[PDB]
Amino acid sequence: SHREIGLLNVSYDPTREFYRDYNAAFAAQWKQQHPQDTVTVETSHGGSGKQARAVIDGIEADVVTLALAYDVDAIAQKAKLIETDWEKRLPDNSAPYTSTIVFLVRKGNPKNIHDWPDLLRSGVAVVTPNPKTSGGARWNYLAAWAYADHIFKGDRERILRYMQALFRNVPVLDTGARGATTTFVQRGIGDVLLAWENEALLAREELGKDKFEIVVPKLSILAEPSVALVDKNVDKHGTREVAEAYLRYLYAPEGQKLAAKHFYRPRHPEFADPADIARFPEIKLVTIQQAFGSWEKAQQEHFADGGVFDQIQANK
């Protein structure tokens, strides 16, 4: 009838399965209450940083569902497409779910990997994506740095040597985290993947507990994937109301339930299937604010061209 509404959600890499289900659920419940409307959502996927650059360069996303807050801030700062106070518009730092970084190892854990120091041992090959393009790659790096900061009581020279030792064991840097997962799980590269927890759980469910094992390290980071309405594009497209509802329904019971089904930790687990909640192990976590002050500080120091990651790679 009256209206066909198209939305583009520019997302990060491993959310493919989640958004296929979520988009259908959102569209169906919208049409139930608004029978003349048909909402068609397209979701694109890639490394979070590359996806953010694509929006800046003209991909007219109505919403962004990215891996971390900096990438949304960059759209707002560098392209003015999002208002700068976006992060407070939705609850929980505009992150309706969270995740963390775990290790995925092969059956039997033949290298006996249990914690961050094992990644530095001779002959261990570590798969982790490219910090210049991937958000998970940056969470992975920051988790490693936070561990080293703890054990070395903040001594920068010792942390840098530890990071160099880690990256000497990293042979390949995939553009997006789904690429990294596939490199390890399907293409047989590496002994351990530094994984989004949702990717580790999905790999174990898809291929079997008989092929891969999740190792929970003794510290990790709270990964907060940030969502935001792209003000200038929804106003250009006439999609503001539906796009707002699309993001807000991620926080509704059905969105929270679907998040847990797809191996993301909901902010409100009371709405999820208890069997899905039971899959999430206890893990000791620092946040971005605690370990690095802010995303702005972490990104500029570590991940900007010429920054610390580039220095580690050049000096290792």
mmCIF file of C-alpha atoms in Angstrom:
data_model
loop_
_atom_site.group_PDB
_atom_site.id
_atom_site.type_symbol
_atom_site.label_atom_id
_atom_site.label_comp_id
_atom_site.label_asym_id
_atom_site.label_seq_id
_atom_site.Cartn_x
_atom_site.Cartn_y
_atom_site.Cartn_z
ATOM 1 C CA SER A 1 0.000 0.000 0.000
ATOM 2 C CA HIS A 2 0.861 3.613 0.730
ATOM 3 C CA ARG A 3 4.580 3.421 1.550
ATOM 4 C CA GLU A 4 7.839 1.574 0.908
ATOM 5 C CA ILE A 5 10.653 2.614 3.244
ATOM 6 C CA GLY A 6 14.243 1.677 2.464
ATOM 7 C CA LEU A 7 16.921 1.790 5.138
ATOM 8 C CA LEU A 8 20.658 1.213 4.797
ATOM 9 C CA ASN A 9 22.487 -0.006 7.911
ATOM 10 C CA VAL A 10 26.274 0.159 7.526
ATOM 11 C CA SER A 11 27.593 -2.388 10.009
ATOM 12 C CA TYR A 12 30.786 -4.120 11.050
ATOM 13 C CA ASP A 13 31.826 -7.562 9.851
ATOM 14 C CA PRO A 14 30.486 -10.398 12.053
ATOM 15 C CA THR A 15 26.931 -9.062 12.433
ATOM 16 C CA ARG A 16 25.770 -10.713 9.168
ATOM 17 C CA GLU A 17 23.678 -13.443 10.825
ATOM 18 C CA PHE A 18 22.247 -11.154 13.497
ATOM 19 C CA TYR A 19 20.999 -8.511 11.069
ATOM 20 C CA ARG A 20 19.420 -11.021 8.698
ATOM 21 C CA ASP A 21 17.196 -12.092 11.615
ATOM 22 C CA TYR A 22 16.831 -8.684 13.265
ATOM 23 C CA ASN A 23 15.931 -6.878 10.053
ATOM 24 C CA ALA A 24 13.157 -9.355 9.332
ATOM 25 C CA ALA A 25 11.847 -9.115 12.894
ATOM 26 C CA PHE A 26 11.864 -5.327 12.924
ATOM 27 C CA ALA A 27 10.202 -5.047 9.528
ATOM 28 C CA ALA A 28 7.508 -7.567 10.447
ATOM 29 C CA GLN A 29 6.535 -5.883 13.709
ATOM 30 C CA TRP A 30 6.573 -2.437 12.091
ATOM 31 C CA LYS A 31 4.245 -3.572 9.317
ATOM 32 C CA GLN A 32 1.975 -5.236 11.876
ATOM 33 C CA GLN A 33 1.282 -1.860 13.516
ATOM 34 C CA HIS A 34 1.679 0.205 10.298
ATOM 35 C CA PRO A 35 0.032 -1.986 7.645
ATOM 36 C CA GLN A 36 0.529 0.430 4.747
ATOM 37 C CA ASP A 37 4.321 0.439 5.303
ATOM 38 C CA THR A 38 6.903 -2.030 4.039
ATOM 39 C CA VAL A 39 10.379 -1.546 5.522
ATOM 40 C CA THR A 40 13.223 -2.982 3.482
ATOM 41 C CA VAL A 41 16.570 -2.879 5.292
ATOM 42 C CA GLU A 42 19.883 -3.540 3.600
ATOM 43 C CA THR A 43 22.849 -4.170 5.895
ATOM 44 C CA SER A 44 26.387 -3.955 4.600
ATOM 45 C CA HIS A 45 29.344 -5.482 6.414
ATOM 46 C CA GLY A 46 33.080 -4.933 6.602
ATOM 47 C CA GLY A 47 35.822 -3.829 8.912
ATOM 48 C CA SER A 48 34.380 -1.085 11.098
ATOM 49 C CA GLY A 49 36.979 1.543 10.246
ATOM 50 C CA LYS A 50 36.727 0.918 6.506
ATOM 51 C CA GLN A 51 32.922 0.997 6.739
ATOM 52 C CA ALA A 52 33.022 4.324 8.574
ATOM 53 C CA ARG A 53 35.292 5.755 5.878
ATOM 54 C CA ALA A 54 32.832 4.521 3.262
ATOM 55 C CA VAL A 55 30.012 6.493 4.913
ATOM 56 C CA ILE A 56 32.219 9.578 5.148
ATOM 57 C CA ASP A 57 33.025 9.159 1.444
ATOM 58 C CA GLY A 58 29.350 9.068 0.448
ATOM 59 C CA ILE A 59 27.626 5.754 1.205
ATOM 60 C CA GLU A 60 24.342 7.164 2.480
ATOM 61 C CA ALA A 61 23.744 5.037 5.536
ATOM 62 C CA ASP A 62 20.589 5.814 7.475
ATOM 63 C CA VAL A 63 22.093 4.159 10.552
ATOM 64 C CA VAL A 64 25.530 2.889 11.472
ATOM 65 C CA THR A 65 26.017 -0.133 13.697
ATOM 66 C CA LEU A 66 29.787 -0.131 14.165
ATOM 67 C CA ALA A 67 32.313 -1.936 16.329
ATOM 68 C CA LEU A 68 33.299 0.888 18.669
ATOM 69 C CA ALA A 69 32.518 4.508 19.451
ATOM 70 C CA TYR A 70 35.503 6.189 17.764
ATOM 71 C CA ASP A 71 34.335 5.149 14.317
ATOM 72 C CA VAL A 72 30.966 6.858 14.862
ATOM 73 C CA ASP A 73 32.694 9.938 16.335
ATOM 74 C CA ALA A 74 34.850 10.072 13.198
ATOM 75 C CA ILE A 75 31.777 10.250 10.958
ATOM 76 C CA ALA A 76 30.410 13.085 13.099
ATOM 77 C CA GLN A 77 33.731 14.977 13.231
ATOM 78 C CA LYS A 78 35.063 14.495 9.720
ATOM 79 C CA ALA A 79 31.847 14.535 7.706
ATOM 80 C CA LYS A 80 29.297 16.256 10.007
ATOM 81 C CA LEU A 81 26.709 13.603 9.112
ATOM 82 C CA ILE A 82 25.934 12.721 12.748
ATOM 83 C CA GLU A 83 25.490 15.180 15.604
ATOM 84 C CA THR A 84 28.482 15.149 17.933
ATOM 85 C CA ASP A 85 26.412 14.238 21.035
ATOM 86 C CA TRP A 86 25.079 11.032 19.420
ATOM 87 C CA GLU A 87 26.469 8.706 22.093
ATOM 88 C CA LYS A 88 24.100 9.915 24.815
ATOM 89 C CA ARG A 89 20.984 9.613 22.623
ATOM 90 C CA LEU A 90 20.567 5.884 23.282
ATOM 91 C CA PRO A 91 21.042 3.956 26.550
ATOM 92 C CA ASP A 92 24.245 2.309 27.718
ATOM 93 C CA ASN A 93 26.622 4.421 25.596
ATOM 94 C CA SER A 94 24.449 3.669 22.531
ATOM 95 C CA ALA A 95 25.452 0.000 22.761
ATOM 96 C CA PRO A 96 22.402 -2.332 23.065
ATOM 97 C CA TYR A 97 24.725 -5.315 23.460
ATOM 98 C CA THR A 98 28.361 -5.920 24.306
ATOM 99 C CA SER A 99 30.997 -8.498 23.622
ATOM 100 C CA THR A 100 34.577 -9.254 24.575
ATOM 101 C CA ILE A 101 37.765 -10.764 23.171
ATOM 102 C CA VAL A 102 38.539 -14.441 23.753
ATOM 103 C CA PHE A 103 40.933 -16.945 22.242
ATOM 104 C CA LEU A 104 39.801 -19.646 19.816
ATOM 105 C CA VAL A 105 42.182 -22.625 19.621
ATOM 106 C CA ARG A 106 42.128 -25.916 17.761
ATOM 107 C CA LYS A 107 40.890 -29.239 19.163
ATOM 108 C CA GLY A 108 42.928 -30.356 22.119
ATOM 109 C CA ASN A 109 44.648 -26.968 22.550
ATOM 110 C CA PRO A 110 47.924 -28.524 21.315
ATOM 111 C CA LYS A 111 50.022 -25.425 22.055
ATOM 112 C CA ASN A 112 48.633 -25.253 25.626
ATOM 113 C CA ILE A 113 47.462 -21.667 25.268
ATOM 114 C CA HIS A 114 45.736 -20.330 28.386
ATOM 115 C CA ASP A 115 46.475 -16.618 28.693
ATOM 116 C CA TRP A 116 48.117 -13.645 26.987
ATOM 117 C CA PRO A 117 51.749 -14.690 27.729
ATOM 118 C CA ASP A 118 51.272 -17.914 25.728
ATOM 119 C CA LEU A 119 50.709 -15.886 22.558
ATOM 120 C CA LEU A 120 54.362 -14.811 22.684
ATOM 121 C CA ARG A 121 55.844 -18.313 22.866
ATOM 122 C CA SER A 122 57.992 -19.537 20.044
ATOM 123 C CA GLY A 123 56.125 -21.292 17.275
ATOM 124 C CA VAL A 124 52.688 -19.954 18.214
ATOM 125 C CA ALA A 125 50.939 -18.352 15.230
ATOM 126 C CA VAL A 126 48.291 -15.759 16.169
ATOM 127 C CA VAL A 127 45.488 -14.631 13.871
ATOM 128 C CA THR A 128 44.160 -11.119 14.484
ATOM 129 C CA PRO A 129 42.751 -8.589 11.971
ATOM 130 C CA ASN A 130 44.211 -5.279 10.794
ATOM 131 C CA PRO A 131 43.810 -2.368 13.276
ATOM 132 C CA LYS A 132 43.764 0.102 10.370
ATOM 133 C CA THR A 133 40.487 -1.321 9.006
ATOM 134 C CA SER A 134 38.875 -3.541 11.671
ATOM 135 C CA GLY A 135 37.274 -2.612 14.985
ATOM 136 C CA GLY A 136 37.739 -6.025 16.556
ATOM 137 C CA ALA A 137 41.406 -5.748 15.624
ATOM 138 C CA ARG A 138 41.596 -2.638 17.789
ATOM 139 C CA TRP A 139 39.736 -4.226 20.700
ATOM 140 C CA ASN A 140 42.159 -7.160 20.444
ATOM 141 C CA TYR A 141 45.187 -4.875 20.571
ATOM 142 C CA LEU A 142 43.770 -2.851 23.453
ATOM 143 C CA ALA A 143 43.034 -5.996 25.454
ATOM 144 C CA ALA A 144 46.647 -7.129 24.983
ATOM 145 C CA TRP A 145 47.924 -3.677 25.934
ATOM 146 C CA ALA A 146 45.711 -3.553 29.035
ATOM 147 C CA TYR A 147 47.071 -6.935 30.137
ATOM 148 C CA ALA A 148 50.653 -5.756 29.690
ATOM 149 C CA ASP A 149 49.878 -2.488 31.455
ATOM 150 C CA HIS A 150 48.670 -4.492 34.428
ATOM 151 C CA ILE A 151 51.604 -6.898 34.658
ATOM 152 C CA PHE A 152 54.213 -4.149 34.044
ATOM 153 C CA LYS A 153 52.530 -1.532 36.237
ATOM 154 C CA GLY A 154 52.358 0.945 33.372
ATOM 155 C CA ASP A 155 56.003 0.809 32.256
ATOM 156 C CA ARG A 156 55.724 1.906 28.627
ATOM 157 C CA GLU A 157 59.027 0.473 27.414
ATOM 158 C CA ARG A 158 58.179 -2.941 28.816
ATOM 159 C CA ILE A 159 54.670 -2.831 27.334
ATOM 160 C CA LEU A 160 56.060 -1.946 23.922
ATOM 161 C CA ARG A 161 58.494 -4.879 24.015
ATOM 162 C CA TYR A 162 55.619 -7.209 24.964
ATOM 163 C CA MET A 163 53.493 -5.957 22.073
ATOM 164 C CA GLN A 164 56.422 -6.430 19.683
ATOM 165 C CA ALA A 165 56.801 -10.013 20.905
ATOM 166 C CA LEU A 166 53.082 -10.608 20.315
ATOM 167 C CA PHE A 167 53.098 -9.140 16.816
ATOM 168 C CA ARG A 168 56.192 -11.138 15.816
ATOM 169 C CA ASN A 169 53.765 -14.083 16.063
ATOM 170 C CA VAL A 170 51.074 -12.503 13.858
ATOM 171 C CA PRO A 171 51.643 -13.498 10.216
ATOM 172 C CA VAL A 172 48.472 -12.072 8.576
ATOM 173 C CA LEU A 173 46.190 -9.054 9.212
ATOM 174 C CA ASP A 174 42.775 -9.447 7.565
ATOM 175 C CA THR A 175 40.706 -6.401 6.686
ATOM 176 C CA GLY A 176 37.664 -7.438 8.708
ATOM 177 C CA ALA A 177 37.100 -9.764 11.624
ATOM 178 C CA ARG A 178 34.958 -12.208 9.650
ATOM 179 C CA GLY A 179 37.972 -12.537 7.327
ATOM 180 C CA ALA A 180 40.187 -13.272 10.325
ATOM 181 C CA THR A 181 37.735 -15.849 11.648
ATOM 182 C CA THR A 182 37.606 -17.520 8.239
ATOM 183 C CA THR A 183 41.411 -17.482 7.893
ATOM 184 C CA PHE A 184 41.657 -19.490 11.120
ATOM 185 C CA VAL A 185 38.554 -21.709 10.973
ATOM 186 C CA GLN A 186 38.270 -22.444 7.251
ATOM 187 C CA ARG A 187 41.722 -21.803 5.760
ATOM 188 C CA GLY A 188 43.755 -23.510 8.462
ATOM 189 C CA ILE A 189 46.095 -20.636 9.296
ATOM 190 C CA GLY A 190 47.298 -20.113 12.852
ATOM 191 C CA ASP A 191 47.143 -21.820 16.208
ATOM 192 C CA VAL A 192 44.971 -19.216 17.936
ATOM 193 C CA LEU A 193 42.479 -16.584 16.832
ATOM 194 C CA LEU A 194 42.020 -13.414 18.865
ATOM 195 C CA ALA A 195 38.279 -13.492 18.398
ATOM 196 C CA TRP A 196 35.179 -11.523 19.074
ATOM 197 C CA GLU A 197 33.353 -13.756 21.554
ATOM 198 C CA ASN A 198 30.365 -13.870 19.228
ATOM 199 C CA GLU A 199 32.636 -15.146 16.405
ATOM 200 C CA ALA A 200 34.211 -17.773 18.670
ATOM 201 C CA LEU A 201 30.805 -19.023 19.809
ATOM 202 C CA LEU A 202 29.458 -19.057 16.256
ATOM 203 C CA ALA A 203 32.475 -21.010 15.005
ATOM 204 C CA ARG A 204 32.132 -23.559 17.803
ATOM 205 C CA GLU A 205 28.428 -24.010 17.115
ATOM 206 C CA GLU A 206 28.765 -24.179 13.325
ATOM 207 C CA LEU A 207 31.813 -26.470 13.110
ATOM 208 C CA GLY A 208 31.478 -28.284 16.438
ATOM 209 C CA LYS A 209 32.994 -28.252 19.904
ATOM 210 C CA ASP A 210 34.992 -31.155 18.435
ATOM 211 C CA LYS A 211 37.088 -28.874 16.179
ATOM 212 C CA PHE A 212 37.586 -25.644 18.164
ATOM 213 C CA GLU A 213 37.802 -24.625 21.811
ATOM 214 C CA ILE A 214 37.316 -21.267 23.480
ATOM 215 C CA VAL A 215 39.997 -20.178 25.951
ATOM 216 C CA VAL A 216 38.997 -17.309 28.226
ATOM 217 C CA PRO A 217 42.092 -15.237 29.084
ATOM 218 C CA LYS A 218 42.649 -13.915 32.591
ATOM 219 C CA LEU A 219 41.819 -10.323 31.566
ATOM 220 C CA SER A 220 39.996 -8.960 28.566
ATOM 221 C CA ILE A 221 38.173 -5.815 27.462
ATOM 222 C CA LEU A 222 34.500 -4.883 27.404
ATOM 223 C CA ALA A 223 33.817 -4.335 23.716
ATOM 224 C CA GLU A 224 30.952 -1.844 23.231
ATOM 225 C CA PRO A 225 29.710 -1.769 19.600
ATOM 226 C CA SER A 226 28.047 1.600 19.083
ATOM 227 C CA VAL A 227 24.961 2.392 17.019
ATOM 228 C CA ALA A 228 23.809 5.769 15.756
ATOM 229 C CA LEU A 229 21.250 7.507 13.586
ATOM 230 C CA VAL A 230 22.904 9.316 10.642
ATOM 231 C CA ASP A 231 21.078 12.633 11.006
ATOM 232 C CA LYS A 232 21.916 14.236 7.694
ATOM 233 C CA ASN A 233 21.081 11.125 5.662
ATOM 234 C CA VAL A 234 17.792 10.287 7.375
ATOM 235 C CA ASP A 235 16.683 13.887 6.920
ATOM 236 C CA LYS A 236 17.673 13.741 3.240
ATOM 237 C CA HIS A 237 15.892 10.399 2.755
ATOM 238 C CA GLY A 238 12.824 11.151 4.894
ATOM 239 C CA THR A 239 13.520 8.064 7.068
ATOM 240 C CA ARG A 240 14.073 9.617 10.513
ATOM 241 C CA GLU A 241 11.103 8.087 12.348
ATOM 242 C CA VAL A 242 11.576 4.546 11.041
ATOM 243 C CA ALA A 243 15.362 4.693 11.469
ATOM 244 C CA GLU A 244 14.947 5.822 15.085
ATOM 245 C CA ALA A 245 12.548 2.957 15.714
ATOM 246 C CA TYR A 246 14.966 0.520 14.066
ATOM 247 C CA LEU A 247 17.734 1.435 16.486
ATOM 248 C CA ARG A 248 15.464 1.651 19.514
ATOM 249 C CA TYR A 249 13.993 -1.796 18.897
ATOM 250 C CA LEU A 250 17.487 -3.287 19.367
ATOM 251 C CA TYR A 251 16.850 -2.491 23.057
ATOM 252 C CA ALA A 252 13.366 -4.027 23.068
ATOM 253 C CA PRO A 253 12.851 -7.552 24.429
ATOM 254 C CA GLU A 254 12.952 -9.107 20.970
ATOM 255 C CA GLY A 255 16.152 -7.300 20.026
ATOM 256 C CA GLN A 256 17.844 -8.360 23.271
ATOM 257 C CA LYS A 257 16.669 -11.945 22.828
ATOM 258 C CA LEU A 258 18.000 -12.039 19.252
ATOM 259 C CA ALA A 259 21.317 -10.559 20.338
ATOM 260 C CA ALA A 260 21.888 -13.399 22.795
ATOM 261 C CA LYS A 261 20.742 -15.994 20.250
ATOM 262 C CA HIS A 262 23.505 -14.667 17.955
ATOM 263 C CA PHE A 263 26.108 -14.837 20.746
ATOM 264 C CA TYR A 264 26.203 -11.170 21.795
ATOM 265 C CA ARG A 265 25.802 -10.266 25.453
ATOM 266 C CA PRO A 266 22.563 -8.270 25.840
ATOM 267 C CA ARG A 267 22.397 -5.285 28.130
ATOM 268 C CA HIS A 268 19.134 -6.793 29.448
ATOM 269 C CA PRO A 269 19.613 -10.574 29.674
ATOM 270 C CA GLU A 270 16.269 -11.009 31.433
ATOM 271 C CA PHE A 271 14.666 -10.849 27.965
ATOM 272 C CA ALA A 272 16.868 -13.572 26.463
ATOM 273 C CA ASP A 273 16.555 -17.333 26.415
ATOM 274 C CA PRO A 274 18.373 -18.537 29.576
ATOM 275 C CA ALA A 275 20.167 -21.192 27.524
ATOM 276 C CA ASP A 276 21.719 -18.444 25.410
ATOM 277 C CA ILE A 277 22.798 -16.520 28.506
ATOM 278 C CA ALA A 278 24.352 -19.679 29.950
ATOM 279 C CA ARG A 279 26.813 -19.809 27.030
ATOM 280 C CA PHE A 280 28.645 -16.691 28.215
ATOM 281 C CA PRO A 281 31.512 -17.540 30.605
ATOM 282 C CA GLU A 282 32.690 -15.441 33.476
ATOM 283 C CA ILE A 283 35.465 -13.097 32.346
ATOM 284 C CA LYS A 284 37.411 -10.329 34.089
ATOM 285 C CA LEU A 285 37.076 -7.127 32.086
ATOM 286 C CA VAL A 286 38.387 -3.589 31.913
ATOM 287 C CA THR A 287 36.573 -0.910 29.935
ATOM 288 C CA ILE A 288 37.961 1.523 27.344
ATOM 289 C CA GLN A 289 37.560 4.376 29.808
ATOM 290 C CA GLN A 290 39.382 2.579 32.612
ATOM 291 C CA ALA A 291 42.271 1.341 30.522
ATOM 292 C CA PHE A 292 42.709 4.203 28.008
ATOM 293 C CA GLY A 293 40.687 7.209 29.210
ATOM 294 C CA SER A 294 38.672 7.582 26.007
ATOM 295 C CA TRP A 295 38.328 6.240 22.508
ATOM 296 C CA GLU A 296 39.742 9.497 21.170
ATOM 297 C CA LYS A 297 42.931 9.025 23.189
ATOM 298 C CA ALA A 298 43.290 5.321 22.401
ATOM 299 C CA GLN A 299 42.672 5.710 18.683
ATOM 300 C CA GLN A 300 45.000 8.657 18.136
ATOM 301 C CA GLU A 301 47.839 7.177 20.159
ATOM 302 C CA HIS A 302 47.690 3.583 18.978
ATOM 303 C CA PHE A 303 45.908 3.348 15.647
ATOM 304 C CA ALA A 304 46.520 6.564 13.719
ATOM 305 C CA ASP A 305 49.062 6.201 10.949
ATOM 306 C CA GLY A 306 52.516 6.638 12.515
ATOM 307 C CA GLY A 307 51.124 5.726 15.928
ATOM 308 C CA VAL A 308 52.066 3.014 18.325
ATOM 309 C CA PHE A 309 50.807 0.027 16.317
ATOM 310 C CA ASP A 310 52.844 1.167 13.312
ATOM 311 C CA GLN A 311 55.856 1.640 15.608
ATOM 312 C CA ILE A 312 55.458 -1.869 17.057
ATOM 313 C CA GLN A 313 55.266 -3.313 13.555
ATOM 314 C CA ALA A 314 58.373 -1.390 12.441
ATOM 315 C CA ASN A 315 60.447 -2.133 15.563
ATOM 316 C CA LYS A 316 59.567 -5.795 16.242
#
